[PDB]
C-alpha cells in the first residue's frame, strides 16, 4: 500500500485514539497493537511527526502525567477544536463510504 | 479537514470507481457528484494528475472510447496491479475501521 495511504490511516487512528481518551505515545502504540491483534505496530517517530503537526495546528495539547508509578509520561489530549476535527473527519469518511455504495448502485 | 485527508478519500473513491468499471474523468466527476447528492465536486486537475501518476505507475491503463457521437473520451482501466491495489486499500481501510471499534 502507498505510504500516503498508510499515513492517512495512521492519522485517522490517532484522532480516534485521542478522541476516546488522552494518551501517551507508548500507550497508543501498545493499545493499537492489541486492538489490531498485533497486526499494526505504529512507530514512535511517525507519532511524533503527526503529533507536532496536530499540536501546532491546535488539534492536540500535551501535559505531564502522574509520576507516582514511576516515569513522567507526556500525555496528549484532543483540544475542543480537535474534537470538531475528529467529527468532520469521521463524517466525511462516512460520506465517502456512502458515495462508494451509491456508485455501485448508480451502475 | 486537512488536504492530505481529502486526497486520501479521493484516492479511495477513484480506486473504487475504476474497480467498478472503466471510466473517464468527466464521467467520474459527474457520477461522484450524483452519488454524493452534489456535495463532492472532484477537481478535474486532481483527477487527471492522480491518473497520470497511476498510469505511469502501471496501476491503470487507458484507451479511447467510441467517437461515433462526436466525443473523444479517454477511458481508464484497472490493470492487474491496479486490481491488486484496490484490494489492499479496501482491506487495509477495513482493518482500520476494525481497530477503531475495538479501541472503544
Residue pointed to by grid coordinates 473523444: B72
- What is the distance between the alpha carbons of residues A99 and A105, in angstroms, rounded to a whole number? 10
In chain B, what residues touch A102 (CB-CB under 8 Å)? 34-36
Q: How many Å apart are CA A5 and CA A8, to the nearest integer? A: 5
- Spatial CB neighbours of B66, under 8 Å, sequence gap ≥ 6: none
Q: Are A58 and A81 in contact (CB under 8 A)?
A: yes
Q: Among residues A56, A99, A15, which one has the least CA distance to residue B20?
A: A99
Can you tell me which residue has the cell 500516503? Answer: A4
Q: Which three cell numbers stand for residue B81?
A: 496491479
Sheet bearing A60-64, strands edge to edge? A23-24, A74-78, A60-64
d(CA A3, CA B1): 19
The most distant pair of C-alpha atoms in chain A lies apart, rounded to whole Å, by 60
Among residues B36, B92, B88, B96, the alpha carbon closest in space to that of A90 is found at: B96
A14, closest residue in chain B (CA to CA): B100
The whole-angstrom distance between A9's CA and the closest CA on chain B is 7
Give the helix, strand, coil percentages of chain A, each rounded to 5: 65, 10, 25
CATH for A3-106 (1.10.10.10, 3.30.470.20, 2.60.120.860, 3.40.718.10): 1.10.10.10
Q: State how beta strands A74-78 and A60-64 pair.
A: antiparallel
The continuous run of DSSP H or E covering A97 comes out as helix A80-106
Resolution in angstroms for this experimental structure? Answer: 2.2
Expt. technique: X-ray
Q: How many Cβ atoms are within 10 Å of B13's Cβ, its own excluded?
A: 22
Asked whether the beta carbons of residue A5 and residue B40 sit closer than 8 angstroms, the reply is no
Instruction: Check if the beta carbon of residue B93 is closer than 8 Å to that of residue A13.
Output: no
CB B54 within 8 A of CB B84: no
Is the backbone of residue B2 left (phi > 0), alpha (psi -120 to 50) or beta? Answer: beta
Whole-Å CA distances, B40 to A52, A86, A90, B34? 30, 19, 16, 9
The distance of B74 to chain A (nearest Cα, Å) reads 19
The dihedrals phi and psi of A50, each to the nearest 5 degrees, come to -60, -40
Interface check for A56 against chain B (CB to CB < 8 A): the answer is: no
**Surface-to-core class of residue A67, CB atoms within 10 Å of its CB (0-12 exposed, 13-18 middle, 19+ buried):** exposed
Are A90 and B96 a contacting pair, CB within 8 Å? no
CATH topology of domain B3-103: Arc Repressor Mutant, subunit A (1.10.10)
Contacts of residue A104 in chain B, CB cutoff 8 Å?
A: 20
A81 touches chain B (CB under 8 A): no
Nearest CA in chain A to B90: A1
Mutation target to probe the A interface, by most A beta carbons within 10 A, among B8, B38, B81, B90 is: B8
Amino acid at each position: 500500500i502507498p505510504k500516503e495511504m498508510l499515513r492517512a490511516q495512521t492519522n485517522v487512528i490517532l484522532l480516534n485514539v485521542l478522541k476516546q481518551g488522552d494518551n501517551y505515545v507508548y500507550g497508543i502504540i501498545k493499545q493499537v497493537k492489541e486492538a489490531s491483534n498485533g497486526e499494526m505496530e505504529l512507530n514512535e517517530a511517525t507519532l511524533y511527526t503527526i503529533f507536532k503537526r496536530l499540536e501546532k495546528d491546535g488539534i492536540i495539547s500535551s501535559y505531564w502525567g502522574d509520576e507516582s508509578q514511576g516515569g513522567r509520561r507526556k500525555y496528549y489530549r484532543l483540544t475542543e477544536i480537535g474534537h470538531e476535527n475528529f467529527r468532520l473527519a469521521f463524517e466525511s469518511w462516512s460520506r465517502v463510504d456512502k458515495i462508494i455504495e451509491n456508485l455501485e448502485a448508480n451502475k
